[PDB]
Subunit: 68 residues, 3 copies
């Protein structure tokens, strides 16, 4: 308790920022499709996708270890 | 101390990322106003606004519990 | 251990979000250069640069204190 609840809202804060991040990335995508980019950016998505997965996996860790 | 100071710069890091997030969201807004979108995106702002508030509230939690 | 490993993946999660943030900021830059903005935004970069440094420094703190 206490110290551990501190890590409670810490993860919650980060989980929420992830959503604001995805919403942000999403906002960027559409701004790039309007312009007219049939590619030549697909490797930029490859990077955010790999960091999103790496992040979502790390959040899983935290949720399971915050069980004990 | 120690463990608790670790949670010190942890929150600080997240509070700073929030600003970089708002700066990011803000950078996206203007790019959407230039184009000419008199709406049809207002529900996307509704989502970031609700996550920004949820986040700002969670940071408050951390600041008060980091008092004891 | 335990509590401390919890702060392990916590920092890792934040370090990863920083990259997704830089990737996000970067995605915004190009969308602003295409349009044609030879300035009048350089003080917006001044803000993200100063928060990126402030953040990268805070992460350093965490990495060194997570040594003891």
């Amino acid at each position: 308790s206490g110290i551990v609840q501190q890590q409670n809202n810490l993860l919650r804060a980060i989980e929420a920022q992830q959503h604001l991040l995805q919403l942000t990335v999403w906002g960027i995508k559409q701004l790039q499709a309007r312009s007219g980019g049939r590619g030549g950016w697909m490797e930029w998505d490859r990077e955010i996708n790999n960091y999103t997965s790496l992040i979502h996996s790390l959040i899983e860790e935290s949720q399971n270890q915050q069980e004990k």
